[PDB]
Structure formats: structure tokens, C-alpha cells
């Protein structure tokens, strides 16, 4: 009865965790912010339109100077744009057409891309030759690659469909650390603005907070009903917001180990595809399947400042570091900049 | 125009050349024939690939009658199909392979599950998907010599309880083909092509060509109005 005893102990520990989480709840966030005046109506205009992709668009990322962009499409192309004059700075052809993610180095010297070939490719932008070369190919995963984010010019972290995440040292090309524990496919991850921890969301409707230097799972969060498609992280470092396939978004807090609010509406019965915050964390922007993306007040959970103007599903959206513009892409092969 | 410096003008010219190159590649990329390959485990698809003179996704190329064919085999991906199938939404056709002589073999740890019923379930799931509502299927039936040799002592009633016919190769093969084609739930927007493969039957590549031609013509009849 050793297996039965171990399962019973696991259930007892789960019940203890639930009891610990029950006694810490006093008042929902909508009660502490009942005296906050609403932000009113928010309207944005399209300032630029970026054209040139000839298929669906799956990822984009902002540079730290708030001036340059990189975007990936399934025509086999990675494009770096200047967003003030709508000029093209670089165009890079990939080896495998089925790309699914992008990352841009925080210094500005490197880009990364991966997809349905179980490989992460790293490209060098600043050479003595005038062209862009392939700097590194990282292999060792067994299922498709769904996200990747630099930490510096030497270390990267990736997530795959194996249920495993990995931390790699670029110079040698070897897996420095592996993070295991999810049951289903991992679809997204979001670093923290100190590169000390990170979060991951999986198809088993769960999220996990991991420590990077130790290399082990630190916390877990549940509550959704279906798989999680996108995850973001609050600016101050103590919260994060998730978006699942339930037509719901949610906010979780690390220190209280609870759930804070849910953002959903009765007229929306589609799935979310991407979320992001704003510089002061007062506007949560989320893309949807209805061909348009919505804007939510983040402290009162009541707004939809629709950014209509796309003809297909919104794949990706992002906000600059200074915070003046917002970019969206979609399956109709157009990017749009709003403020 | 007149408010630009020399360096800005050089940047504009560079962007324009990049645009032209992108456009040329995009025009070239739209005259290829993209086929998606499917078929349950150990169903002769390897022999099919071998005959026509050809981890992650595996991709194969060839050229027939001045046409460029690219075949995609994604058999190694052990994940859930509802996460990567929409990436193949705009393919020209789906090739499907099954084996005729697997109607009396045990598939899984349970002896009840035979292979032909699993292949029928897979075909049903592919045919009536929501991302393939007007994509055509080309169906290959393999190992016909072995089936003909086996039916002498093995009756087809072992797998189809309601079969009330003779025990000859022709009628059994026709019954199997009909039982497969009777699963198309979208009979007006979709068409199904069926073939009986053979070792010396090189025609099984020509057959593919023929089907593709029809598909192309139909698509043209939707560009120039008329549909």
C-alpha cells in the first residue's frame, strides 16, 4: 500500500495548500478600488502601416531603443523595420519556413528564431562583412519550440512542446539547465525585469514560477479551464497576467499566492492570443480571435477600447519601453502602430 | 522629399531595393505544388516515398513534367495536432496511405482494436476537419498482392460483420473502397481520388499528376469569376 499511502499524502498536502490559500483572502481587488475614478474612453489612431509580408505573421519584438522592430512570417522571412520612417533596415531568409517565435537581444547585436524543426537559430547583426550570418544552432529538444528570450549576449532560455524548458549557454552550445514538471505542452514564458526568475504557461491549464540559478520549480498556479496561450509579467515584479482559451484573462500575485481578478465579457466567446501591459500598469491590452484587440482598465476590469482595423486573427502585440506607441500584427500580413 | 538629407535618401533607396527583392521571391514561391502526407503507423507510406524516386518535419522535393513538388511528412511530431495543424491550411492536396492486408491484425495492447478500424477513424478525423473544408484527398491502398494471397484462407467477415458477399479479391476490394469513400461528409465542396498501388505500378506518380491538374483548374475557375 506504499503507492496508496504516497497518493494519500499527496492529497493531504494539496488540501493543506488549499487551506493555507483560503485563510489569506480578505477582500477582492474590486472592493479596494471602488473609489478610483475610471480612466474614461480611450481612442487610438493608426499612425503607420508596415507592408511587405506575404503570409501569416506569427511573432514580433520591440528593441530597447523604441525605434526598431523584428517580425517573422511563414513565407520564410524575418524583417527588421525602422518605425519612424517605415524604412526596412534588414531582411533575413530562414532555413525552415515554419517559424513560430522571435526574440531581439537587449544590446542590439543579435536576433533569434525557432519553430517546427526543434532548433533555435541565433543570428549576428553587426559584422565586418556587411551581411547577416547564422551564429549558432541550438539542438536538443524533441518537440516544437514555442518561445525564447535572451538574458545577455551569452545566455538564452527556451520553451518546447516536450513539457520542458531549457537554459542554454550560447558560446558552447550546451544545455546548461533543464526545467521539468509540466504535464502538457508549454506555450509561453516571460522573464522578469531583473533576470532572476521566470514564469511559464502550459497546455495542462497551469502556470509555474521558476528560479534560474538554482534550476528547480518554485511555485505553481491553477484556476483556468483550458490551455494557456500567452503570459505577461507586471512592471514592478510582483504580479503576472495570463490569457487562456476560455475567453478569459486573469491576474495572479506571487506574494499572496492567490488570484486577483478575471477579465471576460459575455459577448466574447473566442480565444485570446496575446496580452501585454503598459508603462504604469494601468492598461492591459489583449488580442482576440474576433479580428480585433481590446483594451482593459487593469484596476477595475471594465473597458474595451477596441483597436478595430484588422481583417483576420490578431497574432501578436507589443508596447515600447518608453511607452508611446503600440504595435499589432495579424494573419492578414499587416502591422499597425497606434498611439 | 526636399526635407530629406543625403543619408535619408540613401536609406530610402535601400528600402526600395529590399521591397523589390521581396516581391520577386513572393512571385516565385507561388508556383510550387505543396502536398501533405499522412497515414497510420506502418501503412506503406515509406514504400510510397521510395517508389516515386525521391527530428521535426521532414521535407522532400522532386520535379515532374516541369512542375516542382514539395511533400511534407510530419510523422515524427508526437504532440497534439490541434496546436500545429492550422499551419498547413493552404496546401494543394492531402495524400493518405492505408494498407489492405491489415484487416485482421491486433493493433494495441487490447486485442479488440484492429488496424483497419483505426485507419478508418484517422481518415474520418482528417476528412471532416474545420481547416480542411475544401481540400482534396488522394487515397492509396497498399499491399494488394498480400491481401489477395491472404483472402484464400482468411474471410473478410472477421472484420466486417455485415458483409454478405462472395470471397473474391475484386468484390472485397470494391467493398473496402466504398466503405472508405462513404465517410466523406462534405460531398459537394470536396472530391476524393482512389488508387490501387502496385510495386511495378509507376503510374502511381502519374495518377498524382492527374489529380493535381483538376485541382488547379478548379482554383482558376474561382479566380476568373465563374464560380
Amino acid at each position: 500500500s506504499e503507492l496508496d499511502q504516497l497518493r494519500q499524502e499527496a492529497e493531504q498536502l494539496k488540501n493543506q495548500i488549499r487551506d493555507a490559500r483560503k485563510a489569506c483572502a480578505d477582500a477582492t481587488l474590486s472592493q479596494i478600488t471602488n473609489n478610483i475614478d475610471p480612466v474614461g474612453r480611450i481612442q487610438m489612431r493608426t499612425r503607420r502601416t508596415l507592408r511587405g509580408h506575404l503570409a501569416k505573421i506569427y511573432a514580433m519584438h520591440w528593441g530597447t531603443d523604441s525605434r526598431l522592430l523584428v517580425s517573422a512570417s511563414q513565407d520564410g522571412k524575418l524583417i527588421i523595420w525602422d518605425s519612424y520612417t517605415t524604412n526596412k533596415v534588414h531582411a533575413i531568409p530562414l532555413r525552415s519556413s515554419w517559424v513560430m517565435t522571435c526574440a531581439y537581444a537587449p544590446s542590439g547585436n543579435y536576433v533569434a528564431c525557432g519553430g517546427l524543426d526543434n532548433i533555435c537559430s541565433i543570428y549576428n547583426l553587426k559584422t565586418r562583412e556587411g551581411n547577416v550570418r547564422v551564429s549558432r544552432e541550438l539542438a536538443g529538444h524533441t518537440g516544437y519550440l514555442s518561445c525564447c528570450r535572451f538574458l545577455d549576449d551569452n545566455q538564452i532560455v527556451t520553451s518546447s512542446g516536450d513539457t520542458t524548458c531549457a537554459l542554454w549557454d550560447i558560446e558552447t552550445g550546451q544545455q546548461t539547465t533543464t526545467f521539468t514538471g509540466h504535464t502538457g505542452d508549454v506555450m509561453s514564458l516571460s522573464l522578469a525585469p531583473d533576470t532572476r526568475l521566470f514564469v511559464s504557461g502550459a497546455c495542462d491549464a497551469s502556470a509555474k514560477l521558476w528560479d534560474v540559478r538554482e534550476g528547480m520549480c518554485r511555485q505553481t498556479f491553477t484556476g483556468h479551464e483550458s490551455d494557456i496561450n500567452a503570459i505577461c509579467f507586471f512592471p514592478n515584479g510582483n504580479a503576472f497576467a495570463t490569457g487562456s482559451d476560455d475567453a478569459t484573462c486573469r491576474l495572479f500575485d506571487l506574494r499572496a499566492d492567490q488570484e486577483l481578478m478575471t477579465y471576460s465579457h459575455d459577448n466574447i466567446i473566442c480565444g485570446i492570443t496575446s496580452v501585454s501591459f503598459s508603462k504604469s500598469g494601468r492598461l492591459l491590452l489583449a488580442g482576440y480571435d474576433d479580428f480585433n484587440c481590446n483594451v482593459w482598465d487593469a484596476l477595475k476590469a471594465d473597458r474595451a477600447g477596441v483597436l478595430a482595423g484588422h481583417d483576420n486573427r490578431v497574432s501578436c502585440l507589443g508596447v515600447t519601453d518608453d511607452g508611446m506607441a503600440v504595435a499589432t500584427g495579424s494573419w492578414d500580413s499587416f502591422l499597425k502602430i497606434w498611439n | 522629399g526636399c526635407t530629406l538629407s543625403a543619408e535619408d535618401k540613401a536609406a530610402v533607396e535601400r528600402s526600395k531595393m529590399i521591397d523589390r527583392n521581396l516581391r520577386e521571391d513572393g512571385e516565385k514561391a507561388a508556383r510550387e505544388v505543396k502536398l501533405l502526407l499522412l497515414g497510420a503507423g506502418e501503412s506503406g507510406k515509406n514504400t510510397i516515398v521510395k517508389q516515386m524516386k525521391i527530428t521535426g518535419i521532414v521535407e522532400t522535393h522532386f520535379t515532374f513534367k516541369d512542375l516542382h513538388f514539395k511533400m511534407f511528412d510530419v510523422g515524427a511530431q508526437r504532440s497534439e495536432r490541434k496546436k500545429w495543424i492550422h499551419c498547413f491550411e493552404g496546401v494543394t492536396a492531402i495524400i493518405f496511405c492505408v494498407a489492405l492486408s491489415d484487416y485482421d491484425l491486433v493493433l494495441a495492447e487490447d486485442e479488440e482494436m484492429n488496424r483497419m478500424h483505426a485507419s478508418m477513424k484517422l481518415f474520418d478525423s482528417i476528412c471532416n476537419n474545420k481547416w480542411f473544408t475544401d481540400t482534396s484527398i488522394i487515397l492509396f491502398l497498399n499491399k494488394k498482392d498480400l491481401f489477395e494471397e491472404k483472402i484464400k484462407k482468411s474471410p473478410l467477415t472477421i472484420c466486417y460483420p455485415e458483409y454478405a458477399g462472395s470471397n473474391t479479391y475484386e468484390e472485397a476490394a470494391a467493398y473496402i473502397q466504398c466503405q472508405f469513400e462513404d465517410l466523406n461528409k462534405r460531398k459537394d465542396t470536396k472530391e476524393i481520388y482512389t488508387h490501387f498501388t502496385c510495386s511495378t505500378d509507376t503510374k502511381n506518380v502519374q495518377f498524382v499528376f492527374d489529380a493535381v491538374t483538376d485541382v488547379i483548374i478548379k482554383n482558376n475557375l474561382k479566380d476568373c469569376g465563374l464560380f
Partner: single-chain antibody
Amino acid sequence: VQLVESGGGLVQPGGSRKLSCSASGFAFSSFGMHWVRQAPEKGLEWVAYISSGSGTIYYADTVKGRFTISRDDPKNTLFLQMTSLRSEDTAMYYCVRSIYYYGSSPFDFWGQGTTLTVSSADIVMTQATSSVPVTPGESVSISCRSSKSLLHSNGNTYLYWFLQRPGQSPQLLIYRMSNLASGVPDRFSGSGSGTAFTLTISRLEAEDVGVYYCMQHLEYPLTFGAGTKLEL
């Protein structure tokens, strides 16, 4: 990266000649090119410009109509053709590489030059000094001046600083008045404000003495200074 020029020699008055430049070690078809000239004992003088894609060509006021510039991309070669050569065409010519996109460094690699011996809305640049005596370990400051304002409306300031050592070819030091080139010690600096600009050196060493030039790139034609010969 390697540019090699050829075609120089002795030419009698009138006549004609053709100079060529062969490139190796970089993507030659993504770069625009310039031909520049230096008199036997005077400063630098710009000659001609061609761009990437051959969709733009520029000449200088004293050469236009007599010179012709062309490029051959499959073979990676650059050509200049000169006809009706006068006595003011005795100098040393250099081929210069340049690339323009947001954030690039133009005028970064210079050739080795070849010699040729023959038997007004332009901006004026003024090198206020001609020689400076210094000792190693000290600090030095040089300044030059313009006539118009080099600062554009988008925020840039197009001023360049080059060094030429004895027996060598120029070597880019600073582009756009404050940006240090790649492969240069951090003891050099540039600063200034409209119409007056200053280069600064700290803690001199040997092999750090030569002639400094300041150039503008606000509009064509491009105009050089006269040069300051720092001495030790």
C-alpha cells in the same frame, strides 16, 4: 576586407586613363563607393560617388563632364575613366567604402591609393591651426569651423574626423561628431556645437602623431579642411 587600386602612372597633358579597384573579403554589392583625391602636399579633395544599385551618380564641380564612374558587380570591380587631363590632375587617388542605413558607420575602410603624375553654395571648412608642439602623456585639443550650420532638423550633426599617419592612408576616427569608430582607443573624443567643433586627445602615445582632417556630409559636394599637423 581588402581594396586594391591600380592604374596609376605618368600621363602627358591631354590624353586619357582608366583607374580600377578590386575588392575582396566583403559583400561588395551592398556598399556605395567614393573616389577621393589628395594633392602631393595639400589636403584631401572629393572626386566622385556611386551608390548601391547604380541608381545614383555624383561628380564634383571641377571634374563633372570629364570623369566617369562605373561598377561591375559580378566580378567585384570599380572603374573611373578620365579624359582630357590637365596639370591640376597630378595627385593620389583613394577608393572608399560606405554604407547607409539607420545607425551605420560610413567612410569606415579606405584603400591604399594610386598615384597619377601629369607633366558657389558649397560649405567652407576652416582648420584654424596648422601645427602644435606637444609632449607624450599630455592632453591635446584641436578645433575646426564651418560657415553654414551642420545640424539638421532631425537631430543629427554630420561632422567627420580622420587621421593620416606618415606613409599610410587615412583611418576613420569619429563620425557624426560624437561617435567613436570600431577599433579605436577610448582616449579620443569629439564634441562641439553649431559651426565650432573640437576633437580632444588624452594621454598621448607614440604612433599617434599625424595630420587630422575634419569633413562635412550635410550635402553634396563634400568639403574637407586643410589639416593640422600635430608634432612631437
